[PDB]
Amino acid sequence: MTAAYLPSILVPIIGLIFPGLVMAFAFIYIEQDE
Amino acid sequence: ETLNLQIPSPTFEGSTGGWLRAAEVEEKYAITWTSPKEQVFEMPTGGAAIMRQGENLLYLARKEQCLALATQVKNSFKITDYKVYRIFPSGEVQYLHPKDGVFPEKVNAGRVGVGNVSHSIGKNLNPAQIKFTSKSFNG
Amino acid sequence: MISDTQIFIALILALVSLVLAIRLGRALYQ
Amino acid sequence: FSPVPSPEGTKETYWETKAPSSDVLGIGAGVSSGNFAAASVFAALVGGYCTGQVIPLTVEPNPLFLAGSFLLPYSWALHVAAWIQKNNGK
Amino acid sequence: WLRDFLWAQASQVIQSYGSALSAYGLIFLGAHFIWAFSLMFLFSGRGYWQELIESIVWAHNKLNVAPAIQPRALSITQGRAVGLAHYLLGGIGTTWAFFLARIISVG
Amino acid sequence: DVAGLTPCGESKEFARRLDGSVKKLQTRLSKYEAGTPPALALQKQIDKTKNRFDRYGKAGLLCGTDGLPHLITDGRWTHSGEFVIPGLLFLYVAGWIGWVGRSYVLFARTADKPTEKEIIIDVPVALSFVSTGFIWPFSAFKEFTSGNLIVPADEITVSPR
Amino acid sequence: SHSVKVYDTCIGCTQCVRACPCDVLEMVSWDGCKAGQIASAPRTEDCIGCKRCETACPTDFLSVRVYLGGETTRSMGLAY
Amino acid sequence: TKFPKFSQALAQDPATRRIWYGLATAHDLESHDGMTEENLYQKIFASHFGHLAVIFLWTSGNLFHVAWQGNFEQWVLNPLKVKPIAHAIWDPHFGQPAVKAFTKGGVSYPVNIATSGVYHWWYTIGMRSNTDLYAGSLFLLFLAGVFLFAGWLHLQPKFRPGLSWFKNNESRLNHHLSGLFGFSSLAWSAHLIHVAIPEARGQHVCWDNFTKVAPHPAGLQPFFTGNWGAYAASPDTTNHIFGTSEGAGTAILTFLGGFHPQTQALWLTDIAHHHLAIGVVFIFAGHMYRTNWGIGHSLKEILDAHRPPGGRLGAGHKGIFETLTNSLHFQLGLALASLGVITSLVAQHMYALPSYAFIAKDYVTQSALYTHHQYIAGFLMVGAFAHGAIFFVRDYDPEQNKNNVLARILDHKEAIISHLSWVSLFLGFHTLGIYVHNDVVVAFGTPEKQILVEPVFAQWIQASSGKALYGFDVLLSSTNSVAANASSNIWLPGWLEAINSGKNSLFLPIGPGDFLIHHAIALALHTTTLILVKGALDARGSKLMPDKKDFGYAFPCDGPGRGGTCDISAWDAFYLSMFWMLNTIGWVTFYWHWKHITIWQGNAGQFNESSTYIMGWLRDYLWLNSSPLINGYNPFGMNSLSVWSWMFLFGHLIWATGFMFLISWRGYWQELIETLVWAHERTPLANLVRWKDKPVALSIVQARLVGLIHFTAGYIFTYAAFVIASTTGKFG
Numbered sequence A: 001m002t003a004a005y006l007p008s009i010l011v012p013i014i015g016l017i018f019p020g021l022v023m024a025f026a027f028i029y030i031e032q033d034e
Numbered sequence B: 001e002t003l004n005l006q007i008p009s010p011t012f013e014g015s016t017g018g019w020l021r022a023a024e025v026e027e028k029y030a031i032t033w034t035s036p037k038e039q040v041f042e043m044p045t046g047g048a049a050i051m052r053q054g055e056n057l058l059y060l061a062r063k064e065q066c067l068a069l070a071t072q073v074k075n076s077f078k079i080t081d082y083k084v085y086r087i088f089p090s091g092e093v094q095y096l097h098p099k100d101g102v103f104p105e106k107v108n109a110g111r112v113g114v115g116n117v118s119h120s121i122g123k124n125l126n127p128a129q130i131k132f133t134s135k136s137f138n139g
Numbered sequence C: 001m002i003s004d005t006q007i008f009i010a011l012i013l014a015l016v017s018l019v020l021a022i023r024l025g026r027a028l029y030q
Numbered sequence D: 001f002s003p004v005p006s007p008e009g010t011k012e013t014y015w016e017t018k019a020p021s022s023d024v025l026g027i028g029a030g031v032s033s034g035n036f037a038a039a040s041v042f043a044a045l046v047g048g049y050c051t052g053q054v055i056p057l058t059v060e061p062n063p064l065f066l067a068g069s070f071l072l073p074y075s076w077a078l079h080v081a082a083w084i085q086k087n088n089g090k
Numbered sequence E: 001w002l003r004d005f006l007w008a009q010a011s012q013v014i015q016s017y018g019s020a021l022s023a024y025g026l027i028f029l030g031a032h033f034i035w036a037f038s039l040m041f042l043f044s045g046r047g048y049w050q051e052l053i054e055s056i057v058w059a060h061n062k063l064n065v066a067p068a069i070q071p072r073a074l075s076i077t078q079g080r081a082v083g084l085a086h087y088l089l090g091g092i093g094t095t096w097a098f099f100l101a102r103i104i105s106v107g
Numbered sequence F: 001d002v003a004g005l006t007p008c009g010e011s012k013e014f015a016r017r018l019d020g021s022v023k024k025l026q027t028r029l030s031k032y033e034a035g036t037p038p039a040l041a042l043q044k045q046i047d048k049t050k051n052r053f054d055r056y057g058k059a060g061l062l063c064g065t066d067g068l069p070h071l072i073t074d075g076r077w078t079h080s081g082e083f084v085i086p087g088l089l090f091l092y093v094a095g096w097i098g099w100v101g102r103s104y105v106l107f108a109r110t111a112d113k114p115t116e117k118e119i120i121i122d123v124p125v126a127l128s129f130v131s132t133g134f135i136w137p138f139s140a141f142k143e144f145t146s147g148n149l150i151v152p153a154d155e156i157t158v159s160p161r
Numbered sequence G: 001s002h003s004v005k006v007y008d009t010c011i012g013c014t015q016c017v018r019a020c021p022c023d024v025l026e027m028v029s030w031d032g033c034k035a036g037q038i039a040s041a042p043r044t045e046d047c048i049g050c051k052r053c054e055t056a057c058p059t060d061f062l063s064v065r066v067y068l069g070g071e072t073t074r075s076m077g078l079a080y
Numbered sequence H: 001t002k003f004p005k006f007s008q009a010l011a012q013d014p015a016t017r018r019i020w021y022g023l024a025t026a027h028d029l030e031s032h033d034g035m036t037e038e039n040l041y042q043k044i045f046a047s048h049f050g051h052l053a054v055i056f057l058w059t060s061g062n063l064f065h066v067a068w069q070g071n072f073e074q075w076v077l078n079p080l081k082v083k084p085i086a087h088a089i090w091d092p093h094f095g096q097p098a099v100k101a102f103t104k105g106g107v108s109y110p111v112n113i114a115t116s117g118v119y120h121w122w123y124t125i126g127m128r129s130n131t132d133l134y135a136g137s138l139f140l141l142f143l144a145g146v147f148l149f150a151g152w153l154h155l156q157p158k159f160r161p162g163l164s165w166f167k168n169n170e171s172r173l174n175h176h177l178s179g180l181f182g183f184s185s186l187a188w189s190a191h192l193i194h195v196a197i198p199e200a201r202g203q204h205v206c207w208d209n210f211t212k213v214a215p216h217p218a219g220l221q222p223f224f225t226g227n228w229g230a231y232a233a234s235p236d237t238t239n240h241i242f243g244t245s246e247g248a249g250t251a252i253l254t255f256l257g258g259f260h261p262q263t264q265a266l267w268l269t270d271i272a273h274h275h276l277a278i279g280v281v282f283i284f285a286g287h288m289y290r291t292n293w294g295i296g297h298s299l300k301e302i303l304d305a306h307r308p309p310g311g312r313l314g315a316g317h318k319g320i321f322e323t324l325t326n327s328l329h330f331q332l333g334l335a336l337a338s339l340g341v342i343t344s345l346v347a348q349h350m351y352a353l354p355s356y357a358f359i360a361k362d363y364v365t366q367s368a369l370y371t372h373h374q375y376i377a378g379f380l381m382v383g384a385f386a387h388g389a390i391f392f393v394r395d396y397d398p399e400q401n402k403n404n405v406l407a408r409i410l411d412h413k414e415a416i417i418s419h420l421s422w423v424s425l426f427l428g429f430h431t432l433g434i435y436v437h438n439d440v441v442v443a444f445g446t447p448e449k450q451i452l453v454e455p456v457f458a459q460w461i462q463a464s465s466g467k468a469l470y471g472f473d474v475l476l477s478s479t480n481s482v483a484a485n486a487s488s489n490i491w492l493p494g495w496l497e498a499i500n501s502g503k504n505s506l507f508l509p510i511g512p513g514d515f516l517i518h519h520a521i522a523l524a525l526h527t528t529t530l531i532l533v534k535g536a537l538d539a540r541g542s543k544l545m546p547d548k549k550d551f552g553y554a555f556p557c558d559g560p561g562r563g564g565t566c567d568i569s570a571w572d573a574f575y576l577s578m579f580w581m582l583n584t585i586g587w588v589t590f591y592w593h594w595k596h597i598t599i600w601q602g603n604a605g606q607f608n609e610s611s612t613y614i615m616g617w618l619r620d621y622l623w624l625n626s627s628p629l630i631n632g633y634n635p636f637g638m639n640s641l642s643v644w645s646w647m648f649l650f651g652h653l654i655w656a657t658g659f660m661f662l663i664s665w666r667g668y669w670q671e672l673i674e675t676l677v678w679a680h681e682r683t684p685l686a687n688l689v690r691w692k693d694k695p696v697a698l699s700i701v702q703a704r705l706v707g708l709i710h711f712t713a714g715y716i717f718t719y720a721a722f723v724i725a726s727t728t729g730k731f732g
């Protein structure tokens, strides 16, 4: 596979960091009074 | 009129069914009544308590808990001398029930009708006519 | 076969699509 | 809920009479019932003849016969227009 | 459990047709049916069935054959009880047929 | 024959169905002595199986490739005994039951307590009704044309919409 | 809160007021019916939406109608 | 306290219900606080641009991942032997047996094998290399960006369309028929004539040379002469090897009929002539309506004039035009019903007349595609009725529709519901009765007493199209008939070969098992329709709740009075019909898949004999074909069917979890949650942490929805694992 390093870079970020960041910021947004 | 906070409470051994943190930070309800006897009743939140001869006072978390006890005492011990109060964490006490000294099922002058609709229930408006309009479906 | 530079061209255009997706989503959100 | 637009020249076409008003014929509102009835019979015969001449269809057909075969469904609408005009006194 | 217990040992119940154990083969299917039929009562609500009964009552009214004992959908509690009874019958009956055909053939 | 099917009397697979069905019984009969009750029972079954296959062969049924008799229900008269004639028999019995039950429900409406007549049935009156059903097509059609079967739309309760 | 309506088919039987567990309803004077009184709903902020009033009402279609609306701590019946 | 910004009633809820209800109501813009009709139509327009961009991103992603990680160039050389690759696998939870077991496809990395058929589709339409797959993925990425920008632009103040534009039905119909349907069908004919057909004949045509390579040797001169038949001369021979020059003809517009003998797919020149004729017909259709130049029809006038004079339809269609234009739910119901019928036609006509080269030899792809589009069809068909119920509750005005077709439907709704109840019982009693009869009789060792009805009506329809298998000799099967002789010059020689070879799925042979399953399908369609129709027609009112329209579409119940009113809303009839839709598509896809796998072995008699009783379906379909699936891993190892073997169990789990929401109801769970709230408040070191939202049990309607989602997801995942793994494991 060409640019074979890409799954090993992008899959942990997309599968762990991206949901951890949207869960954190969605949690903050849905629980703010203003 | 106002709640005399010093009224002794019915003897009770405690339970887990009583009020929680929302009572001291949102609202608590109180019920007072006069008993001719020192007799056992059932608490809305749990087991059995004993009401003291004379005047009693409880604190409950819900208004419905105060009214459930009030119906129980009226049927079981023929006591109608019950007053239900709402108490806020600012200390302000709100008299609730019976609201004007007379029970709701007995008529009283100076009561203004709220919620009364001048036609029967089938004469309401269909939802389409009041769509994108603020006009109410009750005619 | 596809070169890595071609993959990087695809990632640039998908990034531009992400920026336009955010701007449309914010307009829809008001 | 909001005004629904229709193109300019939209008129009332609802009818509860024996026949609709002649306005339902569009550009054919002024044609007489005799002319629709004769055109309908003419179109039915020419359309049926042209249809019959090309029922075994081949890779190379006569193009005029193809176009003339479209007169058979058109004749149905013509005799309906003849009934509408005869019952409108036209 | 799915493969080596249920699938492997259901061989005797599902191959039982034409033998003396074909009764267990039929009760296996019949109880599978009753179990599924129970979920009609468990997943549904009374108000739908009362409104459906209204249209069926209309068709009886049309032919002047409406009963004097007015039909009702079962109560909320009875709907739950009918669903639970047919669920228990179908699940236990399927196990009964499977257990008995399996152990009569191999034991 | 019809729809590429074969009459069961000359299909060879129907013949193999009969032969396999009899060998299955004979191998069970091979484990019993002659005058025993299991031997008598299995011989009765062998005779019953042979009788059924023989009767089906001569009945005009049409077997498929499988050798199992198939039913033709398109309306042709050569196969009317498979759906049309059983269907006429059914509709007579079903219309009888419907006519008789309707007659009892209309009688029970004119009773002292109409709902007591339906959980405690007046058996002489209900047997009077069950006997009347033999001429239900004429009775029900005369009921229809005399304006007594169908009730008008404005004596029927309907929903608001 | 929930919205509770009383329609003018009310015969003044007081059954809804006795059945209400949260003191939402009361009786007011009205010349429309034979009983001379009609139900009223002055305290709908305390309505929990139980619809015991609707069960108690004997008119053909209910004179009292509860319309479940926005939920609060009171209308959710939460002691926490 | 501000998440449901579109709803002040939800944003003041102090419970966890606010989060759930705010998420589930987000796309119902009509109910949001302060919504006008202007703002409603403009948000719908922009979110339609966003949906279109999502579709183009999904297509570009599939093309990119195949171009990058697939074996399209190896597959294109040998399409019946190579297995297409969907995308590569990078999973750090894998063991080395799993990494090795998924390393199929002729590559050095784990991969999913594609069941979507995109290799056969891209091959047939011209794609040959990885680089033009990549060029196509970059084009779709650009188009996705263009439609994202167009959505943002038409929300800007000068570019926001008015309501008069959004309700100009006549113009939209003219442009969508002649441009969106007709012109794009004509342009797709152009792509096939200019690119796909030359590349099926070995000649590469791309953007670098397509202006100097003529599709036909004569070249646009027979078209401008009326010598159109010169484009049908010399079609592809039956010796043509697809993709190469051997056996190739020069025709570009033919009507041969039947299948290309080597690809087992329809001829590409038939497909090109189909799209040319469809394009011309739809462009003609798009000149019907009057826009700005005085020719054409007013839609309002056509609806107003179609009242039969006998009076049987009342006022006819007067006032229908106003209701349809104003109501978006009526438009949604018509669009979804229409779309649902097409995706069912897509499922039925693509397995019987496949268009892609080398498809129909891939059994997993054929099974997956049929199952996929029938499930999409069932969902679309349920949604059409759901939005018709929402139309009656929300958008239907009885005073603008006096004595219409709509009002007269509501005037005899009891007759329709009662008749639907009768037909469903009439089908159900006797279909279940014949099946149970056969079961008992086979079980007692006597299969010759079965009730086996020959499906003569459908066999007669097959014979009318030329099937010479049942000796009916009618129409096309009759050699000397007016029907057969009329088409003898064109379609009849090729079509007769196609329909009378027993090597394809054109008009599959049928018997008693097909009769019984068609009657079961009919019962399922009637019962699903009964619940959906009853839900739509009783939506406004009934005898239990005559004022049901004042409460909306989705409300829990009317309480325990009047006998009990659980599931009385029109939404609850959507809910109840979803189980019957799942049951219906289950019976349909079980039938398709069992009949096809038995034909693919050469053992059609196994379906013919076992399908007439229910134990044949239980042991010879579910139990027999389960074994390669449930052995995807075992104590002796694992293979590449392990993932489907896991998904199978996963599907059994979710489905059963749905039962918990459907059988147990709210009051129990609220009392549990109150004991947990007490325990948290009383536990030291844990009561330092506090909820912002009060934990409550799910609502009555929400729990019905959660149980339905879990049930449906379990249904889909279980069947997808079975239909893919059993077909892969068996290969037949």
Ligand code: CLA
Pocket (backbone or CB within 6 Å): A006, A007, A008, A010, A011, A014, A015, C010, C011, C014, H054, H057, H058, H059, H060, H061, H062, H064, H087, H088, H089, H090
């Ligand atoms: C709808 C389109 C789609 C889908 C479902 C996938 C799916 C996948 N991609 Mg992606 N990919 C896509 C488009 C898509 N691709 C496009 C267009 C490109 C070109 C720029 C790529 C480039 C790409 C790379 C370079 C890699 C993947 C990888 C993967 C896999 C792991 C997930 C991951 O790391 O994501 C990462 C994906 C990206 C960074 C690309 C952006 C994703 C798209 C454009 C956004 C789509 C949003 C969607 C429409 C809506 C989402 C919201 C939802 C809640 C409704 C998975 C098979 C990895 C892989 O092969 O592992 C084995 C990997 O390394 N993809």
Ligand code: CLA
Pocket (backbone or CB within 6 Å): A011, A012, A015, A016, A017, A020, A021, H092, H093
């Ligand atoms: C969606 C994609 C995804 C990916 C890429 C991973 C990746 C991984 N998982 Mg998995 N996991 C996932 C989803 C995923 N997880 C889900 C959904 C579940 C629930 C079912 C699990 C449950 C699970 C368990 C139960 C275990 C793993 C383990 C592992 C590790 C593999 C084993 C190894 O080599 O040990 C090497 C692993 C390490 C040396 C530790 C990595 C620690 C990371 C790199 C620190 C990152 C800091 C953190 C993410 C900050 C993020 C903040 C926020 C924004 C996200 C690896 C890190 C195993 C593990 O934890 O290994 C110890 C393990 O025991 N996973």
Ligand code: CLA
Pocket (backbone or CB within 6 Å): E055, E056, E057, E059, E060, E063, E065, F097, F098, F099, F100, F101, F102, F104, F121, F126, F127, F129, F130, H418, H419, H421, H422, H425
């Ligand atoms: C003898 C009484 C009688 C009569 C004449 C009818 C007549 C009818 N019913 Mg009703 N029905 C009855 C009893 C009766 N029903 C009973 C007892 C039940 C409860 C199980 C129902 C439940 C029912 C449903 C659910 C439906 C009908 C429907 C129909 C119609 C079509 C025929 C049909 O579908 O049969 C169907 C028959 C049944 C489902 C049950 C019949 C049960 C037995 C066999 C009949 C009753 C026997 C009775 C005890 C007679 C005693 C007589 C004795 C006292 C002398 C028709 C209007 C359908 C409709 O509305 O179509 C428009 C429909 O959907 N019926």
Ligand code: CLA
Pocket (backbone or CB within 6 Å): E033, E036, E037, E038, E039, E040, E041, E043, E044, E052, H421, H424, H425, H426, H427, H428, H429, H432, H527, H530, H531, H576, H577, H579, H580
């Ligand atoms: C195997 C499961 C199963 C079965 C058989 C049924 C059967 C039926 N459903 Mg139900 N349903 C089910 C599951 C099931 N459903 C589930 C899971 C759901 C989702 C919640 C629904 C939701 C649902 C709705 C919403 C509707 C139906 C309807 C129907 C009817 C449609 C078929 C028909 O009209 O005639 C088929 C008739 C039968 C199958 C009856 C069987 C005959 C019996 C078994 C006779 C045997 C008598 C026997 C001697 C009794 C022994 C008693 C013993 C004590 C001695 C029928 C009663 C519709 C309806 O009522 O239409 C009028 C309807 O509106 N169902």
Ligand code: CLA
Pocket (backbone or CB within 6 Å): F073, F074, F083, F084, F085, F086, F087, F088, F091, H423, H426, H427, H453, H454, H455, H456, H457, H458, H459, H510, H514, H515, H518, H519, H522
């Ligand atoms: C309402 C009932 C009903 C429904 C929905 C269907 C539906 C279907 N049938 Mg079935 N069928 C039925 C009744 C029904 N049938 C009956 C009663 C018979 C006679 C046994 C048949 C015989 C039959 C054959 C032979 C075939 C089908 C086929 C099919 C399919 C294609 C359409 C067709 O041929 O219509 C058939 C429609 C009718 C026959 C109309 C029936 C309408 C009336 C009201 C039903 C009752 C008639 C009554 C009881 C008989 C009167 C008495 C008589 C005995 C004297 C479709 C699944 C075909 C198919 O594709 O199979 C795979 C096929 O070849 N059906």
Ligand SMILES: CC1=CCCC(C)(C)[C@H]1/C=C/C(C)=C/C=C/C(C)=C/C=C/C=C(C)/C=C/C=C(C)/C=C/C1=C(C)CCCC1(C)C
Pocket (backbone or CB within 6 Å): C008, C009, C011, C012, C014, C015, C017, C018, C021, C022, C024, C025, C028, H047, H050, H051, H053, H054, H057
């Ligand atoms: C559901 C949804 C919600 C709301 C409504 C909605 C908007 C309509 C809808 C749409 C959602 C949509 C359409 C969502 C669309 C989402 C998309 C298209 C996301 C794409 C993400 C791509 C990324 C992050 C790639 C970045 C590449 C980089 C940084 C590479 C950079 C580089 C490399 C190495 C090489 C080159 C040089 C540099 C530049 C250095």
Ligand SMILES: CC1=CCCC(C)(C)[C@H]1/C=C/C(C)=C/C=C/C(C)=C/C=C/C=C(C)/C=C/C=C(C)/C=C/C1=C(C)CCCC1(C)C
Pocket (backbone or CB within 6 Å): H329, H330, H333, H334, H337, H341, H384, H385, H387, H388, H389, H391, H533, H536
């Ligand atoms: C709920 C509801 C409330 C009100 C609003 C609402 C949204 C509109 C509504 C929804 C309603 C819904 C959801 C309605 C759904 C309606 C549907 C799915 C209607 C299906 C129609 C199919 C037809 C007429 C096929 C005809 C085929 C033919 C004639 C083939 C013929 C033939 C040809 C030419 C070729 C072969 C030979 C033969 C057989 C001769």
Ligand SMILES: CC1=C(C/C=C(\C)CCC[C@H](C)CCC[C@H](C)CCCC(C)C)C(=O)c2ccccc2C1=O
Pocket (backbone or CB within 6 Å): E040, E041, E042, E044, E045, E046, E049, E050, E072, E073, E074, E075, E076, E079, E080
């Ligand atoms: C089908 C159904 C009905 C309707 C069912 C009815 C009206 C039962 C009527 C069936 C006939 C009238 C009697 C059944 C007799 C059978 C032959 C078996 C008898 C079993 C013993 C009781 C004799 C409900 O009322 C209901 C209520 C709440 C949740 C779910 C449901 C539900 O699913």
